[PDB]
Amino acid sequence: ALGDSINPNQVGVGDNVIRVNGRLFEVDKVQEKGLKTSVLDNGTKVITLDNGGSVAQLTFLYKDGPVYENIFNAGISSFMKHALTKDGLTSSEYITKTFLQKAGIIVHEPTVVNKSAIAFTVEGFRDTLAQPAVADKFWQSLLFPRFSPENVKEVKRLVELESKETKRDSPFAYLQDILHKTAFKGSPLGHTSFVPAYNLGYIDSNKLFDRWDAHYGFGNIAVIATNIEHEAVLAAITDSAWVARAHNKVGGVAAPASKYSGGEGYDVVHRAKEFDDQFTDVYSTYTAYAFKAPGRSNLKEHAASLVIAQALSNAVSPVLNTSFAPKRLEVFYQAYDTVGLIGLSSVQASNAQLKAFKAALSKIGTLSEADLAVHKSAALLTAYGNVESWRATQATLIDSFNTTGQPLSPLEIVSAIKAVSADTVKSVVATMLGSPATLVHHGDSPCAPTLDALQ
Amino acid sequence: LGHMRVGALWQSNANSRGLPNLLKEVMAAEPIYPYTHPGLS
Amino acid sequence: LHADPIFNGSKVVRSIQMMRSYHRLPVGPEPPHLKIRGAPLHPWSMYT
Amino acid sequence: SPLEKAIAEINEEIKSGTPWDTLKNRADPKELHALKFAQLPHPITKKVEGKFKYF
Amino acid sequence: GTNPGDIALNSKRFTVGKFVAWACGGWGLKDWIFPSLFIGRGDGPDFDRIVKHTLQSSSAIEKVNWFDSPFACYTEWFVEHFPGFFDSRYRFEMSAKTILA
Amino acid sequence: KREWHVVPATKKFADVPTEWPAKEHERFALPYGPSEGRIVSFMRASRIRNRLLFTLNPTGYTEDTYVTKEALRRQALAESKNLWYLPERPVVADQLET
Amino acid sequence: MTTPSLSSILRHTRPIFKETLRAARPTLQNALPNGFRIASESKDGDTCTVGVWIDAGSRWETEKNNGVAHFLEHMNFKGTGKRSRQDIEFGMEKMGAHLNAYTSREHTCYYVKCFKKDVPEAVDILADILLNSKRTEQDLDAERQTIVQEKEDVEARIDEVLMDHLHSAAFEGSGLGLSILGPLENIQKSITKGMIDDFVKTHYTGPRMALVGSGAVDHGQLCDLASKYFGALPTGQPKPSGFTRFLGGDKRETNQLNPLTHVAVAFQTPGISHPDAIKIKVLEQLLGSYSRDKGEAAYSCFARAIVMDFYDPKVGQFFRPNKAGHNPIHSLNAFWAPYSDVGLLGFYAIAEPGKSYGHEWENILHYAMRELIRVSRNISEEEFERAKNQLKLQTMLQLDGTTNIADDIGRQVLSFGARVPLASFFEQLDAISREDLIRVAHEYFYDKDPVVAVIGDTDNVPEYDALRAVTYSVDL
Amino acid sequence: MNHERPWVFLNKVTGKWGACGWQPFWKATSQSLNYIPDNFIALRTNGSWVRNLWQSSKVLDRGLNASGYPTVGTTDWVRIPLDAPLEA
Amino acid sequence: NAVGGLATSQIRDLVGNPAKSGKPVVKMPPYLKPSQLRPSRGAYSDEFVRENYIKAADPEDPYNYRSRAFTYAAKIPMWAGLLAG
Amino acid sequence: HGSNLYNRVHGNLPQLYVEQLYNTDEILDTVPHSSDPVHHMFPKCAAASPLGFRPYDNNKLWDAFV
Numbered sequence A: 001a002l003g004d005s006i007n008p009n010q011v012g013v014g015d016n017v018i019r020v021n022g023r024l025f026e027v028d029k030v031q032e033k034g035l036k037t038s039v040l041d042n043g044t045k046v047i048t049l050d051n052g053g054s055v056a057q058l059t060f061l062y063k064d065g066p067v068y069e070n071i072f073n074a075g076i077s078s079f080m081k082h083a084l085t086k087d088g089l090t091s092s093e094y095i096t097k098t099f100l101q102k103a104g105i106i107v108h109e110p111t112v113v114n115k116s117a118i119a120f121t122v123e124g125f126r127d128t129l130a131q132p133a134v135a136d137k138f139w140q141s142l143l144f145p146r147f148s149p150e151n152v153k154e155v156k157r158l159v160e161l162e163s164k165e166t167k168r169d170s171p172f173a174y175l176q177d178i179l180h181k182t183a184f185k186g187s188p189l190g191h192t193s194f195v196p197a198y199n200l201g202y203i204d205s206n207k208l209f210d211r212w213d214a215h216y217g218f219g220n221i222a223v224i225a226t227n228i229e230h231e232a233v234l235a236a237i238t239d240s241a242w243v244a245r246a247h248n249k250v251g252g253v254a255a256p257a258s259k260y261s262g263g264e265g266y267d268v269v270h271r272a273k274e275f276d277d278q279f280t281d282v283y284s285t286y287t288a289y290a291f292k293a294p295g296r297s298n299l300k301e302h303a304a305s306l307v308i309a310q311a312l313s314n315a316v317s318p319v320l321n322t323s324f325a326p327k328r329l330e331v332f333y334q335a336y337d338t339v340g341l342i343g344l345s346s347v348q349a350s351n352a353q354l355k356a357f358k359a360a361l362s363k364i365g366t367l368s369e370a371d372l373a374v375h376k377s378a379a380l381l382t383a384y385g386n387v388e389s390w391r392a393t394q395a396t397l398i399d400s401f402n403t404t405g406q407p408l409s410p411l412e413i414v415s416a417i418k419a420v421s422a423d424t425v426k427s428v429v430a431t432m433l434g435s436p437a438t439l440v441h442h443g444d445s446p447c448a449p450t451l452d453a454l455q
Numbered sequence B: 001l002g003h004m005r006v007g008a009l010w011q012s013n014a015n016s017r018g019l020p021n022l023l024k025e026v027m028a029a030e031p032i033y034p035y036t037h038p039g040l041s
Numbered sequence C: 001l002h003a004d005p006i007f008n009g010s011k012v013v014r015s016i017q018m019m020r021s022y023h024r025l026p027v028g029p030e031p032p033h034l035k036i037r038g039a040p041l042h043p044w045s046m047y048t
Numbered sequence D: 001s002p003l004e005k006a007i008a009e010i011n012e013e014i015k016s017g018t019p020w021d022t023l024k025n026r027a028d029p030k031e032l033h034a035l036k037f038a039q040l041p042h043p044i045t046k047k048v049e050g051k052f053k054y055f
Numbered sequence E: 001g002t003n004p005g006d007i008a009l010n011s012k013r014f015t016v017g018k019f020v021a022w023a024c025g026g027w028g029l030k031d032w033i034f035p036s037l038f039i040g041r042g043d044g045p046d047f048d049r050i051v052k053h054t055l056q057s058s059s060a061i062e063k064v065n066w067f068d069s070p071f072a073c074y075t076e077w078f079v080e081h082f083p084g085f086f087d088s089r090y091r092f093e094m095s096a097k098t099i100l101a
Numbered sequence F: 001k002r003e004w005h006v007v008p009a010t011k012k013f014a015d016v017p018t019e020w021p022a023k024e025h026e027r028f029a030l031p032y033g034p035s036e037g038r039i040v041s042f043m044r045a046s047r048i049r050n051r052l053l054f055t056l057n058p059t060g061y062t063e064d065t066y067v068t069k070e071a072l073r074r075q076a077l078a079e080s081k082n083l084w085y086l087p088e089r090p091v092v093a094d095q096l097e098t
Numbered sequence G: 001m002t003t004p005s006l007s008s009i010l011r012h013t014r015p016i017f018k019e020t021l022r023a024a025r026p027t028l029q030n031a032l033p034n035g036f037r038i039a040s041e042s043k044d045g046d047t048c049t050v051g052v053w054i055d056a057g058s059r060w061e062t063e064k065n066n067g068v069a070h071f072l073e074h075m076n077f078k079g080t081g082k083r084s085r086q087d088i089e090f091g092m093e094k095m096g097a098h099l100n101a102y103t104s105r106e107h108t109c110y111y112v113k114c115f116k117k118d119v120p121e122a123v124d125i126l127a128d129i130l131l132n133s134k135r136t137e138q139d140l141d142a143e144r145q146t147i148v149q150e151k152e153d154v155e156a157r158i159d160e161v162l163m164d165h166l167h168s169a170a171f172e173g174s175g176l177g178l179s180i181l182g183p184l185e186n187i188q189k190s191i192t193k194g195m196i197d198d199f200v201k202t203h204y205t206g207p208r209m210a211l212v213g214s215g216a217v218d219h220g221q222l223c224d225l226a227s228k229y230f231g232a233l234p235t236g237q238p239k240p241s242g243f244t245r246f247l248g249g250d251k252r253e254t255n256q257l258n259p260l261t262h263v264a265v266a267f268q269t270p271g272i273s274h275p276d277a278i279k280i281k282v283l284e285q286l287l288g289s290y291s292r293d294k295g296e297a298a299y300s301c302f303a304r305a306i307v308m309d310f311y312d313p314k315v316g317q318f319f320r321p322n323k324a325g326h327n328p329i330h331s332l333n334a335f336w337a338p339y340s341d342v343g344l345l346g347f348y349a350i351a352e353p354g355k356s357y358g359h360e361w362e363n364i365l366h367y368a369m370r371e372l373i374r375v376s377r378n379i380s381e382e383e384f385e386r387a388k389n390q391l392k393l394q395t396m397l398q399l400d401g402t403t404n405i406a407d408d409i410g411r412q413v414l415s416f417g418a419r420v421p422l423a424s425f426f427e428q429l430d431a432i433s434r435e436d437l438i439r440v441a442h443e444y445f446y447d448k449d450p451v452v453a454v455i456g457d458t459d460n461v462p463e464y465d466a467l468r469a470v471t472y473s474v475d476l
Numbered sequence H: 001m002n003h004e005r006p007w008v009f010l011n012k013v014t015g016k017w018g019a020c021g022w023q024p025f026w027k028a029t030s031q032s033l034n035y036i037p038d039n040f041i042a043l044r045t046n047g048s049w050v051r052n053l054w055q056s057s058k059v060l061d062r063g064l065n066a067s068g069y070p071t072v073g074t075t076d077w078v079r080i081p082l083d084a085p086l087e088a
Numbered sequence I: 001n002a003v004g005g006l007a008t009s010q011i012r013d014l015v016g017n018p019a020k021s022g023k024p025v026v027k028m029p030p031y032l033k034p035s036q037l038r039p040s041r042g043a044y045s046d047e048f049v050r051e052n053y054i055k056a057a058d059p060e061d062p063y064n065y066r067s068r069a070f071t072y073a074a075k076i077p078m079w080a081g082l083l084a085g
Numbered sequence J: 001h002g003s004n005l006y007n008r009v010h011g012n013l014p015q016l017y018v019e020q021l022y023n024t025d026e027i028l029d030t031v032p033h034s035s036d037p038v039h040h041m042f043p044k045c046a047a048a049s050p051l052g053f054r055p056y057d058n059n060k061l062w063d064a065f066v
């Protein structure tokens, strides 16, 4: 105890322990709040959603992505995805990552969220993330870059591998890339998420520095936390000397809106001649049949679209799932600011299948209040599943803040899903079917369905 | 210099061991008010 | 809620670890030193 | 006094007996120790020993 | 009044410690060849005696605040070496309580 | 959610010196290169010789309490929490080097 | 590169590990006189996961009915005496839920995520499919082709094929070394209604089944339902207790057209219920993991030793420098696969095949085995602490969501007999000694026979004999 | 040293129980005056297992249906831990 | 049958089950029809190797200490003869 | 044990400890302080006995030799 030459184990129970009619109990307090938001006087915005869990995630959101590129910069954001994580001016890659990894912190690979921002996410016990050193390292990375040529060469190798692997191992993700590229033909949402071949040689340190200067500004950075008390977060990202040593400037970047074509339309690749057939699928054609759907701008229409997407997904996917069920279909709902896509991506698609999907959507249109209860319940089950998970909470916060600029806790979405109305869903489906389709073909085979054969 | 103590407050060293608190040794984790203040919250 | 240490503080324990009078003989109400054939030895005996 | 009450209660309780006097079904300690050594892994060699070994 | 330390590294048949003991004092061939007589039962806690003394005790074991006191870490030593420990401890604690009352 | 409260960015970094070069550079100035002469620099390069360096003074600073002009300069810069003082890492030595 | 690097001159601040310990509600458990167990962990919420965990995987097959466990899983969903497949699907759809079945080598589970108001109906459907399902030959003949397609699909997953190779090599002559789905010839012709019925009768017994509830659930209600439905299960014969011998060796599949090479090297370890389980977990976290996106930022002595030889200029006195063009490692991961009897502890490396008859894989395995020997001889205190903290965090990271919590509860109930409280687990994690960890590492790594699985360009991956000669050093 | 906490063997067919645990032991020599041995049978515990055993004795001797407890090898003995008092 | 007005099962049967395109079929030259000319195995079958080459298991020795000890002891005389020679 | 220099400097007559930055050992030739740690006779035995340990371990070669 608090003695000299006294057994350290010679200590009694804590002062917060009581013994009542035998077995002992403990006394403690209460904590936690809802969703909280703040803005630093230099422009940075902080969003927090505490839930009382012991594991926390901290994300630095940096505003850059395909929607900010042009045909000559295509893919530059991908370099920015990695260049910022490599050696900087004041901390190399070895210093930061190891220092974070040896501190029991999981460092995730940076990602592009809504084609408009880059998230650098870190995961660990809240107490380890609340200390002002992790945030300090992220500030160093974002504010004092170096963009060394050898690091740029490494990033070129990484982006080549990413594109090739996604094409080979994630044919549905590549199909989504094609779907957006042809969906929003002459608009920012139609830019490519992968570096095109030519630009692989063109992007270098000077271009990266020019883009960093263009996108510089504390207004292009946000902090999002999911199991850290708000005040602690403010105590962590404001103790950095490097923030005080950086040029103070609020610099925003804006991108235009989008329109929608997609099409009876096609990206040709002979997979059987590109990859070895044993450990990848090389004899399939990937068809994405998509319609225009509302974005996150209007919460009511977004909740209606969520209900519609859940209804479509449950009516197609098997109810009884086995261990090794293959992946042949996916019902996707990609929601953006003021525009979105909802559709079905499949292999070996058929005109009969796509007609059935369209008819199912139309049938969903005509449902009544009583018939909408079942689908609302299924959507609520999914929404609660998102509410109960810290990873899902972080994803929802990032998406809601990025697309609209107004955070939205998963629980709030629940309140919006059970306020959905039959009239709202009817209007939403009328909007969906009142515009041309996207029959974005990708694959190889010539027997693929065509829009003239559907509509 | 190792672990230098700060302040000359009391430490249970060989010369000084202090006056034992038998009340806390016996009534460990059990409140005293049930006996000194019966029937009061 | 933890105050400056004092010698008569609330968190001071009896000294039963550190030996002071090693060569004493405890005295008080104590059992007779009975001797039996085969029974297990008493803890408080010179034999173990 | 509460001390007197407690002493009297204990005195009355011991008349009924104690587990060492009332428990009927109880194995000898030698059988239990033999079973421990013959079936459970040794905490040093991390394997099951046949019997008790000094080294 | 002895802490064995690390049981793992002292249970081996041949050890630097045992050879040093043989050379200078404390160990020898009599210990390897005849462990029944020169190591014998050995010195350590007696589970069987602890169980006997625990089961001989009355309900005073339930009603005693011993397990939360700073001396709870000495429970087995006293249970083994203090026959009738819990009854005496219960009388001691009730004496303190009645003085308090 | 809809309301963004305004929080100061770096309150800890107001009212700290921000002038680089600072005033310490005036006090602890070394216009003649290293502050220790050749012989002195020869005696501090060996653990044995170093003991003789201070033992020549029967009553002088020991090898543990002895400080140099550069060391005092760094201490003075660190004590004043100047914004533009980037701390430097002392040369870390592995086993054999030591 | 005119921009200086101040990181080489600056003094950096080191974050330290400080854990967060939120007290969760204790996991209650009860047992019917039949022996069927009921485990439940309740938490505030609106959704709950209710499932049945069964302790009968594919580990109990003798190559005459290999894959019968998976066939049974597919057959349970084809209708019961009361309901049909359409009725079961309709019930699930009305509840707005999905019924997931997962089959492993030593565990199966059927679970449903639902609202707290659908718990009795979910338990009813689970009992209906598990106990009262009729498995007729016609349906058995109508699922053979779907299972064949599933076999062809799972054969295309490189990681799963590699782990199947590792188990086939390690455990030959026992069901633990057979594939879950089984031979194609068994799928199409051999497995029969008789085999399925024997498997169900032998392995779906009382004391080998648990009903697990996680989330907004009531333990008393769960117990009442379990007595109502699962109280009639037989107290069948005990789980088989045989000897599964570990055979050091190699299983190498040659495919020179593959873009990446996968190499898994594993060593025999005791089971999951052995007292060395926590020490083996700490070893697994000590070897750590590495991904290509980190570059030189490898936080373990193991991965780092294997990575820095592709950044070392390799300048020598009498030989020309030989620096690799680029780092070829795609990933390194330490894994531990335990089973009630045995275990496989090792590493899994994915890297480019490289120039034909190169030295990349020779170097990779050279340094991997050197690091294994080194940790067998000595471990540093700072890396010991890192490994323990990472084990804490990893154990906590797996408990995200009611379904994951229920899976953990069920697996621990089937393995250890009851869920170990996290605090209790952590209590045993701060009592580990560095010397004990070194002893465990030396017992199972030094001069032992490994099992190797290779998929890819085996032209460059060293053969078994060489690998057997690097598990020890002349100096020792 | 870190071994298992004391447990209770219980034989089903015979219906007979008994505590057990791992007893460390060492060669006898001089003791230490300033040291009272800690809890060695139940390491890192406040020694509650004695209280749990005393409380559970009536439960066990009365006849316990321990079919929900693991067995010891192929014998008829099952292990009951003494971490918490046994009520069933 | 209808879940909230939708004949989901019907939709499933029309949407949820796309056809899977497998490997192309290779026409077999008539001289390869005999089974032994298209091998699927080496010399020995598993059963054979499990009866002749694999050692008898020792359940008390799951780490092959016996085999290691025997082989190293049997190597000792070779080194001894070479050294003396 | 650990030095008491902070207290000695912040004590009541710090001028007496100016000599402690010369070539001078604290334990042997410095003015004792009111709050100094208690020094024992055989510090090895004093530190080992309360932990249950004999001062010397035969397994350590250095201790065996000593």
Ligand SMILES: CCCCCCCCCCCCCCCCCC(=O)OC[C@H](COP(=O)([O-])OCC[N+](C)(C)C)OC(=O)CCCCCCCCCCCCCCCCC
Binding pocket: I081, I082, I084, I085
């Ligand atoms: C150096 C080249 C490489 C060599 C590698 C190893 C070669 C293969 C292994 C060795 C095989 C032969 C071992 C012979 C041992 C038996 C004889 C012996 O030594 O007796 C001891 C005994 C020892 O005698 P002693 O005198 O010491 O014994 C004491 C006896 N009292 C006390 C009674 C006096 O005899 C001798 O040593 C006699 C002298 C040496 C004899 C040499 C014999 C031939 C050696 C070569 C044979 C190999 C093939 C030919 C090679 C030719 C090369 C040019």
